[PDB]
Design a protein around this ligand. Sequence first.
Ligand SMILES: O=P(O)(O)O[C@@H]1[C@@H](OP(=O)(O)O)[C@H](OP(=O)(O)O)[C@H](O)[C@H](OP(=O)(O)O)[C@H]1OP(=O)(O)O
Ligand SMILES: Nc1ncnc2c1ncn2[C@@H]1O[C@H](COP(=O)(O)OP(=O)(O)O)[C@@H](O)[C@H]1O
Ligand SMILES: [Mg+2]
Ligand SMILES: [Zn+2]
Length: 385
Amino acid sequence: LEEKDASDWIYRGEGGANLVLAYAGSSPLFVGKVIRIQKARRVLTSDEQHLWRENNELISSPNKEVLEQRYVQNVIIPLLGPKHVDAGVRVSVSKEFLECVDKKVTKQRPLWRVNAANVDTSHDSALILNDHSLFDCISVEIKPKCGFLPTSRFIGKENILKTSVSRFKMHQLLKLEYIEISEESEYDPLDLFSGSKERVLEAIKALYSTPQNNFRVFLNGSLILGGSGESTGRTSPEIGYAFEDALKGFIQSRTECFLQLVSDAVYGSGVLDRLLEIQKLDKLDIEGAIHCYYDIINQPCPICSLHALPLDESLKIVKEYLIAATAKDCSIMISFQSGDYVSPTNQTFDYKVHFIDLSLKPLKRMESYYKLDKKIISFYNRKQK
Ligand SMILES: O=P(O)(O)O[C@@H]1[C@@H](OP(=O)(O)O)[C@H](OP(=O)(O)O)[C@H](O)[C@H](OP(=O)(O)O)[C@H]1OP(=O)(O)O
Ligand SMILES: Nc1ncnc2c1ncn2[C@@H]1O[C@H](COP(=O)(O)OP(=O)(O)O)[C@@H](O)[C@H]1O
Ligand SMILES: [Mg+2]
Ligand SMILES: [Zn+2]
């Protein structure tokens, strides 16, 4: 892949860690593909090698692309089944390709995403996945987050709100406080993962209203609702109307029909149940896991029973924490086009559900995970009153 192929890629979005471009070309090699490119903010550490030592191919990975590839394949797939997970094929890229591509997209990237990161033009590799906004095609991206309450004996007396109130809902307050969002989200993950149909519908309405970085809709691969590479403001009446109009033809009628159809899809695919069992791989909560983290790296625990545990035990706990970290921050894409089908307008739609962004979380991140958790609850406690 060379500098001149850069033209054949168009901006599609990004998260904290990767840039994503869809193919606008004619090449059979790349039709229906997106290209996923790692960013450098501004291979495995010794402790990681040991943590994930159970998979040897995984920890001998030469670069980060093959790393995520094997992670998903060897650690995640066995857990979520391969029907909705794609580990993505690896492709070679040149420096001038990434540089040029990076030059190209800056214009459509959000400002604070540009301040924080660019493309890591030092990588000689990049991941090619299937464009899930392509089966007319209406795809929907959901970022569910953690859909459960912690229950740990390791959550302090001073933190009696963490077993009652979702981490999402507490985080909304902090986000708002640092001018990262404009108004509190109506979305509640507990509704989405509730495994009740009525309550999934509730969550999907809630997502439509205040989408933030949790909800997005694409027509033939182009954003029609939701922020581009970022969070977006509440859906205003102008937004409502233009999204409504973007629907014509697809929903024979429209917005409420669409949300019902999304709700029925999610629910009847039970794709969120399996995801939830993985998230729940966080059996102790950070307030528990962090102690094990300090044993692992053989550092005296600054935070101070959990320490009386065998290394292998401590290791599996921090391992599964990170694995749940991954499930807690992945996303789901559901493709729609007129056993996996959905049905007033009398239409029946086919649909496909995929997992995206199953990224391996850096072990070092256990420290800032604890720092942030600490910050979330102490800000939520203060507020009540
Ligand atoms: O810590 P969280 O729960 O806020 O999750 C982060 C997400 O924030 P969110 O609350 O969804 O707005 C966050 O999303 P944004 O960057 O805020 O769009 C990232 O996806 C981040 O992962 P990473 O930086 O790409 O490795 C996420 O970090 P991890 O928890 O996966 O390490
Ligand atoms: N296979 C795919 N099909 C369609 N869109 C995708 C695909 N992979 C990524 N994207 C788009 O690009 C965005 C960034 O993807 P993601 O893998 O979440 O990046 P990050 O690792 O930075 O969080 C996603 O939110 C999604 O809309
Ligand atoms: Mg993601
Ligand atoms: Zn400790």
